[PDB]
Amino acid sequence: HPEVKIKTILSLFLNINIDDFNMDANLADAYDMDSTELADLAKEIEKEFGISVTKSQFSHWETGRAVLDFVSSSLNDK
Amino acid sequence: HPEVKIKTILSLFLNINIDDFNMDANLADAYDMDSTELADLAKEIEKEFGISVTKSQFSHWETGRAVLDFVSSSLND
């Protein structure tokens, strides 16, 4: 259930109730996510799923759905 | 899917890969969880699920499964 894992990781990272996280919301708009925070999020994703993420890759994470699609593709290849 | 949420929270909390987390393992033995950390975990659970947890309730969180079953029954309530 990669969607639930991602939703949970993003919710914890942003200090919000899991029920309140919107996977389709723009992260910068909805949660005030900045590029420094994306880098920190990427490090948690790398550890929790055991995958590599480049700066170029995490720079395109505009929504939770985008993070999910990246992690899904990475896990399939792994 | 409360089990997946709990496994993910515990894995992040304890700095381990989600696929490596054993929901039935004793948290103190397997992951060196002490009472200070347990209190901090309870604060995260309270925030993430929007529930109350007392010290007497979280003291029984000996495994990830205990956390799961507590949260599940709290959410039903």
Side-chain angles (χ1 to χ4, degrees):
Chain A
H1 312 71
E3 192 274 337
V4 178
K5 291 166 187 183
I6 295 297
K7 192 186 221 201
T8 302
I9 291 156
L10 285 159
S11 297
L12 280 161
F13 186 84
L14 299 161
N15 195 33
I16 63 155
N17 199 283
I18 296 174
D19 281 359
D20 294 347
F21 189 78
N22 183 350
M23 286 286 290
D24 295 309
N26 180 272
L27 294 166
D29 171 47
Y31 312 113
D32 210 41
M33 176 87 71
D34 60 30
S35 57
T36 298
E37 282 178 299
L38 271 178
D40 291 340
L41 174 61
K43 299 212 169 268
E44 295 190 0
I45 291 292
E46 287 179 310
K47 173 57 198 175
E48 295 307 303
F49 292 105
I51 61 173
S52 303
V53 188
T54 68
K55 189 173 184 290
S56 172
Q57 288 167 328
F58 71 67
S59 75
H60 287 63
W61 293 351
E62 280 182 44
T63 62
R65 182 82 57 208
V67 184
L68 169 59
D69 295 347
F70 178 84
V71 171
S72 293
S73 301
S74 294
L75 291 176
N76 290 353
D77 297 331
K78 190 186 160 172
Chain B
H1 321 265
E3 175 163 9
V4 174
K5 294 168 179 173
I6 295 292
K7 191 182 219 268
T8 303
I9 291 162
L10 280 162
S11 292
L12 279 159
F13 186 83
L14 296 163
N15 191 38
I16 68 141
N17 189 285
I18 295 166
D19 290 338
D20 293 350
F21 192 74
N22 179 355
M23 288 285 293
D24 292 302
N26 181 272
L27 296 167
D29 174 56
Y31 311 113
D32 299 342
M33 171 85 73
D34 63 30
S35 65
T36 301
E37 290 175 287
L38 191 59
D40 291 338
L41 175 62
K43 292 200 191 81
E44 295 199 355
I45 293 293
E46 289 177 305
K47 174 55 193 170
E48 292 308 305
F49 291 102
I51 64 180
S52 300
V53 189
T54 65
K55 187 172 189 212
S56 73
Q57 293 168 321
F58 73 69
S59 74
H60 296 109
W61 294 355
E62 305 196 39
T63 63
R65 187 167 300 286
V67 186
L68 168 59
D69 289 352
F70 178 86
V71 169
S72 289
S73 72
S74 295
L75 295 176
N76 294 340
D77 302 344

